[PDB]
Amino acid sequence: GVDRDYLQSEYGVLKAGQCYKVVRSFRDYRNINYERGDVMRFLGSNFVPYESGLSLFFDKNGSERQIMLCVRPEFQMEIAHHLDSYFCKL
Numbered sequence: 001g002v003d004r005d006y007l008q009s010e011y012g013v014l015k016a017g018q019c020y021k022v023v024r025s026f027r028d029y030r031n032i033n034y035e036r037g038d039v040m041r042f043l044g045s046n047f048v049p050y051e052s053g054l055s056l057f058f059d060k061n062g063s064e065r066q067i068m069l070c071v072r073p074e075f076q077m078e079i080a081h082h083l084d085s086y087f088c089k090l
Contacts, residue, residue: 001064007044012083014042020087026079029068054080
């Protein structure tokens with residue numbers, strides 16, 4: 001999958017190698033829903049300043065998921081700026 005060596009190892013509360021429970025269901029920029037109760041391991045992030053395009057990479061049951069968030073008020077800044085509303089460690 002994604003080349004991990006390009007990824008930032010921490011993004012706010014998210015630390016690579018740690019597992020997180022989704023504590024509020026949310027939909028990403030691709031309009032994919034992640035359901036409360038889901039558990040995923042953080043792999044790392046990448047931010048593309050031009051598009052305000054934040055990618056949060058996770059492992060879920062062995063499959064790589066790219067959660068894409070557009071970090072703008074009208075899109076998903078809400079999620080990117082309040083990650084502890086959405087993810088809880090353990």
